Amino acid sequence: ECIENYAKVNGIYIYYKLCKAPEEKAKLMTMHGGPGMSHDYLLSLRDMTKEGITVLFYDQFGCGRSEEPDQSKFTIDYGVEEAEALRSKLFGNEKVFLMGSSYGGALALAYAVKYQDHLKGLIVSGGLSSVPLTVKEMNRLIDELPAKYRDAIKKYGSSGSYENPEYQEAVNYFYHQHLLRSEDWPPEVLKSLEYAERRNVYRIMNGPNQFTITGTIKDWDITDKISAIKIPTLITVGEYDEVTPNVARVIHEKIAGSELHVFRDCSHLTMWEDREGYNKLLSDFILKHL
């Protein structure tokens, strides 16, 4: 199994899980989405160890098993230093690959913008360089939703009545349409969702739900900066991704040399909807840039 540990990182105790590859060829660091989720829903990327790729999972500040730091530290810039601190505290001066999903991708970009010198490659799956853009795009998704659920999200949404069952059905439908297109959501995914609903980070940095981004990052946007990323970048996105491929396009358009792969018939959690295709894509990318 993977080697887990609860070591002090950048001041606070963080939880990380290192899964070493039998014949290691590259170290891949992962950043879960949210803010407030956990590494749990990214475990599917573990398969890559079978491809000589060591994968490092870890719960960010206030997430999963890691401890919650002062609320003044609930920032993307903070997560970056946390990541760097973890990357050096575990691998030292070794250049690794960084992957980020959803908010984790945005975080991955932020990190890459400052610490790309420590990276051999950047992977952004369903990530974003601008929240407003992401919001401008999710609103469109809600409008394209069958009125039944659209009116509900818009009705109880303005009254902050997220507890209402009618609003729930809509949030459920939307999720099964742009978050994970499948009947049986895997435990790992439900665990990460459960975690975000039990900790504070999600409520403070993101907001009520997946498309109600009213938290402290509602205005985050580093699009006019990501252009500085010169390292090999692989940007993926699902056809029906809640963080639309158009949002991915913006990242691709800036990062020169970057690749943009849209997973057809996939949504946000493409690592589960197409675990084999998704993993093969990432592993092939990494190995081609050792």
Ligand SMILES: N[C@@H](Cc1ccccc1)C(=O)O
């Ligand atoms: N909270 C969702 C989508 C999202 C991420 C980041 C910002 C806004 C929305 C996720 O990470 O799966």
